[PDB]
Short mmCIF file of C-alpha atoms and ligand atoms in Angstrom, two decimals:
data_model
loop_
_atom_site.label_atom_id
_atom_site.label_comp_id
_atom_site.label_asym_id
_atom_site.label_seq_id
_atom_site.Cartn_x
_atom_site.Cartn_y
_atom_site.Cartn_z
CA UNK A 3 0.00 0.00 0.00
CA UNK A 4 1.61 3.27 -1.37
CA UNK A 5 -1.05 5.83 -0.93
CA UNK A 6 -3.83 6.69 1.43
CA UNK A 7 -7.50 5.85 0.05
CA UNK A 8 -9.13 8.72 1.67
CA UNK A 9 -6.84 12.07 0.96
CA UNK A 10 -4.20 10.62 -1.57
CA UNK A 11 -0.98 11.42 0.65
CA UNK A 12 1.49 8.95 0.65
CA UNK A 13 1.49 6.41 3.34
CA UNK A 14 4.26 5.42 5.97
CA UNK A 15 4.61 2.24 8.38
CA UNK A 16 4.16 2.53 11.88
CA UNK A 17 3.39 0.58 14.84
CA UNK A 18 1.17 2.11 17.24
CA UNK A 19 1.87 2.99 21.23
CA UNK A 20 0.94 -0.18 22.74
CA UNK A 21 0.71 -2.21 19.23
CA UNK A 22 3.96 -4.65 18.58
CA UNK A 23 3.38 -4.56 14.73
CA UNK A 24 2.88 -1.94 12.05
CA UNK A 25 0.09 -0.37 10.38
CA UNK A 26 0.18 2.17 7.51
CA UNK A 27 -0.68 5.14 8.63
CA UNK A 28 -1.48 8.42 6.69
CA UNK A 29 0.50 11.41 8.12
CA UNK A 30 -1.43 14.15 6.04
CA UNK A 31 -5.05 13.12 7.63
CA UNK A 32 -3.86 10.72 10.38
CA UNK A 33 -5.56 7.96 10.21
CA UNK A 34 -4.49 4.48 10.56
CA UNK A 35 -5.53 2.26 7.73
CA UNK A 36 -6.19 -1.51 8.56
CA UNK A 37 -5.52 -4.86 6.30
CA UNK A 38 -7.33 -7.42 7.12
CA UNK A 39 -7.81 -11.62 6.12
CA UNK A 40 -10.57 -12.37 3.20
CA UNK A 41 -13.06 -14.33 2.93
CA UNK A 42 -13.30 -17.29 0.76
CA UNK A 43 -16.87 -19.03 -0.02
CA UNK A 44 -17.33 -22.30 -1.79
CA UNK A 45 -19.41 -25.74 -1.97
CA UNK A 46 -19.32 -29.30 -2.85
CA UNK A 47 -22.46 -30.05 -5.57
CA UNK A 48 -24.07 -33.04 -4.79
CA UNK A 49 -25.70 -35.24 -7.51
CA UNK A 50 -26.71 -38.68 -6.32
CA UNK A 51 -23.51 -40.04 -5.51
CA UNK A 52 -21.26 -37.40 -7.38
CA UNK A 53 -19.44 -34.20 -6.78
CA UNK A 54 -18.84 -31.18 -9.57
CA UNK A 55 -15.56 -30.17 -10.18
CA UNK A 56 -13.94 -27.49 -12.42
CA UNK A 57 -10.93 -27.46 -13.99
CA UNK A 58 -9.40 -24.23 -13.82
CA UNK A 59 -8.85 -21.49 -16.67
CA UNK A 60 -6.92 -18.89 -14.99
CA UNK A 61 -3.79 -19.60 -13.04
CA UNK A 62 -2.39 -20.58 -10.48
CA UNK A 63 -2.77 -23.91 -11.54
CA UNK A 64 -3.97 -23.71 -14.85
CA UNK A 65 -5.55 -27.40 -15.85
CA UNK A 66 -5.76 -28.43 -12.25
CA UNK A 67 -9.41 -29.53 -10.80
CA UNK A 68 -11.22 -27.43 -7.56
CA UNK A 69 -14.87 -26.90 -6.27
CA UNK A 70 -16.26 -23.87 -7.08
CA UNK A 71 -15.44 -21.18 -4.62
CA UNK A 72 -14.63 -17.44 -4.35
CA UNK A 73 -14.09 -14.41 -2.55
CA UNK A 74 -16.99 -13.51 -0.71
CA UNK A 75 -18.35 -10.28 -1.85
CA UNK A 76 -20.37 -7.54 0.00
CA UNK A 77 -23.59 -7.05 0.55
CA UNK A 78 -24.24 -11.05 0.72
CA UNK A 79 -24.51 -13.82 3.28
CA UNK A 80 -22.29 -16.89 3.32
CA UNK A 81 -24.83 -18.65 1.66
CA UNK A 82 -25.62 -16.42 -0.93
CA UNK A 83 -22.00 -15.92 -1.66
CA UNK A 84 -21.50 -20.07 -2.12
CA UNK A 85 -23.97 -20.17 -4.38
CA UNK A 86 -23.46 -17.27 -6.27
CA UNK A 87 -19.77 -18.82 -6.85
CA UNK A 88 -20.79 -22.05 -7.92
CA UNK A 89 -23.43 -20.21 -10.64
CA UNK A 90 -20.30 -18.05 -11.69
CA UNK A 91 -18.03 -20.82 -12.56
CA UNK A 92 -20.17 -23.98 -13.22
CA UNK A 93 -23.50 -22.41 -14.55
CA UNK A 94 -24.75 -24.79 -11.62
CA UNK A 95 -27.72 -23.94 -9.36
CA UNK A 96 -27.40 -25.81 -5.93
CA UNK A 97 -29.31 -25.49 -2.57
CA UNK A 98 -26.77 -24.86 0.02
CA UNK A 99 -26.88 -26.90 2.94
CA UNK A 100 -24.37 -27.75 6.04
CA UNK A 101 -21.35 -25.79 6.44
CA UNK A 102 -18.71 -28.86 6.30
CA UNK A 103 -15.50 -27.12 6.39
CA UNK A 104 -13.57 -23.78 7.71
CA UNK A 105 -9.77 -23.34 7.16
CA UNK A 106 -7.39 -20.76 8.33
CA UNK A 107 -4.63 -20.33 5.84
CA UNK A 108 -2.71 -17.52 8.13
CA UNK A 109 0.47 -16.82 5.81
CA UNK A 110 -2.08 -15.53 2.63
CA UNK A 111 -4.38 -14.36 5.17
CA UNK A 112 -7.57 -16.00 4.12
CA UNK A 113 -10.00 -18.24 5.34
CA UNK A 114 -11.97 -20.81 3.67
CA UNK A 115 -15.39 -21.79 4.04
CA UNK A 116 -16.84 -24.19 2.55
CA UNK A 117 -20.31 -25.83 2.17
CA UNK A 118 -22.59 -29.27 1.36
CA UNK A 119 -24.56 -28.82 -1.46
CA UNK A 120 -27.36 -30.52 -3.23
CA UNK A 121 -27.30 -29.92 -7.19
CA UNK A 122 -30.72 -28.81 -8.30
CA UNK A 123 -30.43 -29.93 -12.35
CA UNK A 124 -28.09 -31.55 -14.71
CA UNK A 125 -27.88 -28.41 -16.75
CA UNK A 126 -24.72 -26.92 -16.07
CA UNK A 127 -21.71 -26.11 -18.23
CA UNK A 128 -17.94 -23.66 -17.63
CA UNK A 129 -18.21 -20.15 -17.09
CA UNK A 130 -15.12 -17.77 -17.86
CA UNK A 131 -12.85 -19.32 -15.12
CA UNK A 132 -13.52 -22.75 -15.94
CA UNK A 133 -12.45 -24.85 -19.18
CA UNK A 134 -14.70 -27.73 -18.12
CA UNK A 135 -16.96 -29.16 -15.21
CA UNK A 136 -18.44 -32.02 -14.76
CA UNK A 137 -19.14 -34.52 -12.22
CA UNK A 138 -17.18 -37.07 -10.14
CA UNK A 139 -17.39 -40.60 -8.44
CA UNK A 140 -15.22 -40.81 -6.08
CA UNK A 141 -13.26 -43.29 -7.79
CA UNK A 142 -12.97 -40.76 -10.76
CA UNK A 143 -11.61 -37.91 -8.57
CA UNK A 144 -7.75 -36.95 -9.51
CA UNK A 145 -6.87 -36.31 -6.43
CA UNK A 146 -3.02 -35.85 -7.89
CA UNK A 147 -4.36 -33.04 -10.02
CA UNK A 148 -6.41 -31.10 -7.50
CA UNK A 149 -5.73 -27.80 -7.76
CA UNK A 150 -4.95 -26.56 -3.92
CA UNK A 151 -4.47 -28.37 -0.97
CA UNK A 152 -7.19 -25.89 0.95
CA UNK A 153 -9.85 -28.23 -1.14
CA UNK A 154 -8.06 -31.54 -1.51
CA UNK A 155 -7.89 -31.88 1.73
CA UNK A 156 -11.68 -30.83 3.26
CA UNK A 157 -12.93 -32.90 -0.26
CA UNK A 158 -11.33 -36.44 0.49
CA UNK A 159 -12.13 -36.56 4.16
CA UNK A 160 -15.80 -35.83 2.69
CA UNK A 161 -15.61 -38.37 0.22
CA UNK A 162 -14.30 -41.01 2.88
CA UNK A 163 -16.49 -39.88 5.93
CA UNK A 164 -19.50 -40.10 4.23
CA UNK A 165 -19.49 -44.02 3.83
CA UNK A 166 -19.61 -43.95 7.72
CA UNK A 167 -22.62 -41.46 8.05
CA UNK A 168 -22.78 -37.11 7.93
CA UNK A 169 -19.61 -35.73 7.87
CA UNK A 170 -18.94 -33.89 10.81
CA UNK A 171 -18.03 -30.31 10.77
CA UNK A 172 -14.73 -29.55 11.01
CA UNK A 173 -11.88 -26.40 11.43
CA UNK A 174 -8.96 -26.75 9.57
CA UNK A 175 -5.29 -24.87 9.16
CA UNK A 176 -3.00 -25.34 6.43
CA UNK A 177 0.45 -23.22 7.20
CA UNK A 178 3.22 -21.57 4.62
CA UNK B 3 -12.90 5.64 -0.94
CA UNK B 4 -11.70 8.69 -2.44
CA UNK B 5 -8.05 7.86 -3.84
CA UNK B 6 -6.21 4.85 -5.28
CA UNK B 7 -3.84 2.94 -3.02
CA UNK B 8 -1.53 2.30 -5.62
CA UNK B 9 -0.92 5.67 -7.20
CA UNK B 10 -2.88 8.01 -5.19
CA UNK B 11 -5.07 8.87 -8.28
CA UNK B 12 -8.57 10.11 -7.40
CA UNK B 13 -11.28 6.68 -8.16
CA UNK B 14 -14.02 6.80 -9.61
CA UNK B 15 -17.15 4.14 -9.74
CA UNK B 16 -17.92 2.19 -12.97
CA UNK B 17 -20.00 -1.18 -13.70
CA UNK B 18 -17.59 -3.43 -15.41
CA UNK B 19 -18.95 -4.81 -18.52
CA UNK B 20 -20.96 -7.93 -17.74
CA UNK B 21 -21.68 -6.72 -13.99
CA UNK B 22 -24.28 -5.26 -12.97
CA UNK B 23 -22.44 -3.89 -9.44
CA UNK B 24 -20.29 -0.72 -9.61
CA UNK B 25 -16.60 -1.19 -8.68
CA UNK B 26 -13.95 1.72 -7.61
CA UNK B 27 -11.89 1.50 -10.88
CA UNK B 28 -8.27 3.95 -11.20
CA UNK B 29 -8.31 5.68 -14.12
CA UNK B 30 -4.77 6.53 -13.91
CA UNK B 31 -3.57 2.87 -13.26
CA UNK B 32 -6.45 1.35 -14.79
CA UNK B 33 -7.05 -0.84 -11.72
CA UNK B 34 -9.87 -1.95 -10.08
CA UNK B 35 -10.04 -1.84 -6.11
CA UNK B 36 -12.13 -4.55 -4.97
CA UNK B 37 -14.03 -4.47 -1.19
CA UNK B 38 -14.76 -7.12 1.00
CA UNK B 39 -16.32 -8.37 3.93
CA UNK B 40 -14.78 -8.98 7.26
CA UNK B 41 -14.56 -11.04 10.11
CA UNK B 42 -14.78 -10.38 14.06
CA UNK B 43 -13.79 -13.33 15.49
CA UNK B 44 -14.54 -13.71 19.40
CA UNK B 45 -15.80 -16.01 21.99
CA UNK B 46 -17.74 -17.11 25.00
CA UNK B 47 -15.60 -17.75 27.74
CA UNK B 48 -17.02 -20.18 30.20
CA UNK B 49 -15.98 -20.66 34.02
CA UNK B 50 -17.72 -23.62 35.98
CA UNK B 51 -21.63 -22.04 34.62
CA UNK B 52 -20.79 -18.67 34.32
CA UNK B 53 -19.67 -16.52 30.99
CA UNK B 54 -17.68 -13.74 30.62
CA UNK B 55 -19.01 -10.76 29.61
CA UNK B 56 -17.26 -7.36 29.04
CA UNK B 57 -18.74 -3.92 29.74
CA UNK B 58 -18.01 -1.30 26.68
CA UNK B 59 -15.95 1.80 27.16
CA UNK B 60 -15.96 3.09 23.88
CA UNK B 61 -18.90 3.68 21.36
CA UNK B 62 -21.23 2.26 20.24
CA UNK B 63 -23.46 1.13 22.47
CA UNK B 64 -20.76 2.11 25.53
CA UNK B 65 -21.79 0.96 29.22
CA UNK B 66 -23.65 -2.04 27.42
CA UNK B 67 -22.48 -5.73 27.82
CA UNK B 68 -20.61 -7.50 25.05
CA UNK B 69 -18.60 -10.83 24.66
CA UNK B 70 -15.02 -10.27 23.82
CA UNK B 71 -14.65 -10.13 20.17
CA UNK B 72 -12.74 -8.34 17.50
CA UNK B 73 -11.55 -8.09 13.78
CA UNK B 74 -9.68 -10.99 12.89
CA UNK B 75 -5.75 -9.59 11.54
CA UNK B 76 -3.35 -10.44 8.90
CA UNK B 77 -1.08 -13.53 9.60
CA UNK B 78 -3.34 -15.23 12.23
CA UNK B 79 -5.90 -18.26 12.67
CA UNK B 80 -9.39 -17.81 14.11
CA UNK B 81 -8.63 -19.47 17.03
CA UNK B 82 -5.52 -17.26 18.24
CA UNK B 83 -7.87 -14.25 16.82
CA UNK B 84 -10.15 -15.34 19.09
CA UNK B 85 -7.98 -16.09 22.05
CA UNK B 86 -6.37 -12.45 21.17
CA UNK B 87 -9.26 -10.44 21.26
CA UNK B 88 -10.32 -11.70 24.59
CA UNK B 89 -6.38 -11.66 26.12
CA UNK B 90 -7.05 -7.85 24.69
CA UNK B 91 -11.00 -7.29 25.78
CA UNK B 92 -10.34 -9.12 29.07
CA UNK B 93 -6.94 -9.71 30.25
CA UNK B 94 -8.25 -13.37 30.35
CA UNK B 95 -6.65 -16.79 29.01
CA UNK B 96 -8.78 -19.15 27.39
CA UNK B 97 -8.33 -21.87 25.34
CA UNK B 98 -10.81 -22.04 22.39
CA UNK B 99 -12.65 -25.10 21.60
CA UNK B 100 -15.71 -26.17 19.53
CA UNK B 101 -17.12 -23.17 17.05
CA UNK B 102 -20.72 -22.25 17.97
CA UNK B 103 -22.03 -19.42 15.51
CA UNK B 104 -21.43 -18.38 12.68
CA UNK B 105 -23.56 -14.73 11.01
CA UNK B 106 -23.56 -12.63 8.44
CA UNK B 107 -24.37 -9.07 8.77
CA UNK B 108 -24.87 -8.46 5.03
CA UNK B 109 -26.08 -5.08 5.51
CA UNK B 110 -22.42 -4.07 7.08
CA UNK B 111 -20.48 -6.70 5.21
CA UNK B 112 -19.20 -8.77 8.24
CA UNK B 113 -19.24 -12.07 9.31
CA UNK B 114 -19.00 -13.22 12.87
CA UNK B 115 -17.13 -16.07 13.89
CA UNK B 116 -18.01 -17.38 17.80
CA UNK B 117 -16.20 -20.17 19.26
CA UNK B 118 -16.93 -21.95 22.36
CA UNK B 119 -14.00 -21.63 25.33
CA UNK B 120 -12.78 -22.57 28.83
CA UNK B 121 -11.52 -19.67 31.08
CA UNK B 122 -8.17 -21.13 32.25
CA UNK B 123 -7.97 -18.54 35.54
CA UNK B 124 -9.88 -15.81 37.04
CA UNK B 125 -7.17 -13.70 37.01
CA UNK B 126 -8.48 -11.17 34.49
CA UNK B 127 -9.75 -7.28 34.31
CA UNK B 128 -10.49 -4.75 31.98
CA UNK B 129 -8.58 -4.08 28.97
CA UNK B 130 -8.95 -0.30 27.31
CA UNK B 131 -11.82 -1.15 25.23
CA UNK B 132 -13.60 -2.37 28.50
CA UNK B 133 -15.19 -0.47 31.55
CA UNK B 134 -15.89 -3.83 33.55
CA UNK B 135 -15.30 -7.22 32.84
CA UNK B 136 -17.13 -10.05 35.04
CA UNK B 137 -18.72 -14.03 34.91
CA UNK B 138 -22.06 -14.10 34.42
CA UNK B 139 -24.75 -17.32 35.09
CA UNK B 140 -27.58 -17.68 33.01
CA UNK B 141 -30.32 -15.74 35.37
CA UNK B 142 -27.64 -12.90 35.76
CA UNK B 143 -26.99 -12.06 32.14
CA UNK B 144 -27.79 -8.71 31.39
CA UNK B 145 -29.85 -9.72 28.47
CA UNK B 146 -31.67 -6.12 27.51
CA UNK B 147 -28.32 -4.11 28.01
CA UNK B 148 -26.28 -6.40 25.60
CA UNK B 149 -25.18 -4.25 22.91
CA UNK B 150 -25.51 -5.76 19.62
CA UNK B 151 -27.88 -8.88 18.61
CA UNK B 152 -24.93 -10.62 16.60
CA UNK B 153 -24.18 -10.96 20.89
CA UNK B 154 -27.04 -11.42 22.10
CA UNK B 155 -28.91 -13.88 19.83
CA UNK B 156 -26.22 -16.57 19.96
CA UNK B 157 -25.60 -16.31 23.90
CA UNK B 158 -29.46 -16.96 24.16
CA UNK B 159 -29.44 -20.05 22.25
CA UNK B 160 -26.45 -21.27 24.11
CA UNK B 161 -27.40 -20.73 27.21
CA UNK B 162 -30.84 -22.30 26.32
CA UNK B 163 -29.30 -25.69 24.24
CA UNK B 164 -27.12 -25.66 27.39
CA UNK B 165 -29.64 -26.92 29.44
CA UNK B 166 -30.95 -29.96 26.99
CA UNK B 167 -27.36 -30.59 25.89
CA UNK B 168 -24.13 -29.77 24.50
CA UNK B 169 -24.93 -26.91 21.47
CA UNK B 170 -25.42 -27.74 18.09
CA UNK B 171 -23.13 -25.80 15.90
CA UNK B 172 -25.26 -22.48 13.54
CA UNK B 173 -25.43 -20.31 10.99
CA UNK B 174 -27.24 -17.18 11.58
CA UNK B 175 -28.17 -13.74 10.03
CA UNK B 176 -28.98 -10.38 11.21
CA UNK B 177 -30.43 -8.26 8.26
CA UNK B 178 -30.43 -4.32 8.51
CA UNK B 179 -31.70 -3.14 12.00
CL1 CL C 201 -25.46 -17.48 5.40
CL1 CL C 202 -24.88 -25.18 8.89
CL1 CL C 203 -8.26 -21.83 13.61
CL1 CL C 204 -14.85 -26.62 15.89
CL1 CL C 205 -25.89 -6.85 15.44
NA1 NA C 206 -15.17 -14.60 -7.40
NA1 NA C 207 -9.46 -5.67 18.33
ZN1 ZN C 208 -4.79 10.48 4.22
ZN1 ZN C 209 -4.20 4.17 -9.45
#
């Protein structure tokens, strides 16, 4: 950050009496301007026994598979914002249902949510992000060629809980 | 937002072809400066069948009741955000367990993040954001001065699953007051 969003002047790092770490601060309005983690809403789609994936159009990871997820935007609920995702880059309507997983990825600063979904109709095809989607057995997931471990991980223990009953929330971390 | 960060041009807003929502776009970089929501993570300390509850000094809402609670930063989890706002709030240790609720404030863009957590000592007192700072059972809660509902809501339901069990994890939302 370079330049203060409120008067233009340019802005300086400093760490506040009683803070340990520094803030930008603007010196010709003084104000202290806050960063802060974001938000990142997504779903599995449910069909029967199936999950929709997307292979990826814009890199990182180019090629490489992932639910459909996003930055949550304002103005929207969690819900809202998982579906709206999934609509973006799959053309898919879904139902949202149980929030299944929350990860704190601390050294990017973002957290992941992510929800169960139920798929609503077959008729679903890539938006601009994707190249393709489609849906998945579990013994047709690439798991190799998953784009990011964030949903690798949350999507397998889904996959292998749910022989043994609901998955059960859980709150992940995935470190640098 | 008046300026860009980048270049300190003044920003203007524009619907980006094939929106529908205006964005603050740079006209000198040619940048677009995306907002988002954010999080206040906090918690509900417990001690034996008492909460913690902290007393606002600063406004809103000051002299009303609040749990301890506070934006998430850069470079942490939610659980040492949590544990972090209420060594800050509170002066109090905890150790966070299970997460409870979960709301979205859409009208504000926030989302509220509410774990479960076990007092480790008593040995706690106000912090500058906090006039008082005390444990609280169920029939003492000062239910009508708690400050906001994202607060109060939750604690309610707690308190009241409490008493048939141990509480079910939920989502909520709080729509425009
Ligand atoms: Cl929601
Ligand atoms: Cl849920
Ligand atoms: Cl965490
Ligand atoms: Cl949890
Ligand atoms: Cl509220
Ligand atoms: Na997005
Ligand atoms: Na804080
Ligand atoms: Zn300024
Ligand atoms: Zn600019």
């Amino acid at each position: 950050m370079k330049f203060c969003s409120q008067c233009g002047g340019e802005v300086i790092l400093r760490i506040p009496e009683g803070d340990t770490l520094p803030r930008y601060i603007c010196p010709k309005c003084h104000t202290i301007h806050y960063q802060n983690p974001k938000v990142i809403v997504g779903c599995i789609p449910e069909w029967e026994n199936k999950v929709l994936l997307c292979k990826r159009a814009i890199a990182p990871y180019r090629g490489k598979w992932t639910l459909p997820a996003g930055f949550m935007e304002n103005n929207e609920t969690l819900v809202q914002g998982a579906a709206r995702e999934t609509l973006e880059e799959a053309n898919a309507r879904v139902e949202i249902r149980e929030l299944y997983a929350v990860y704190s990825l601390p050294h990017i600063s973002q957290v992941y949510m992510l929800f169960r979904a139920k798929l609503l109709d077959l008729d679903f095809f890539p938006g601009i992000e994707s190249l393709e989607v489609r849906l998945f057995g579990e013994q047709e997931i690439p798991w190799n060629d998953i784009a990011f471990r964030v949903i690798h991980d949350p999507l397998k223990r889904y996959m292998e809980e749910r022989h043994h009953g609901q998955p059960a929330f859980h709150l992940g971390i995935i470190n640098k």
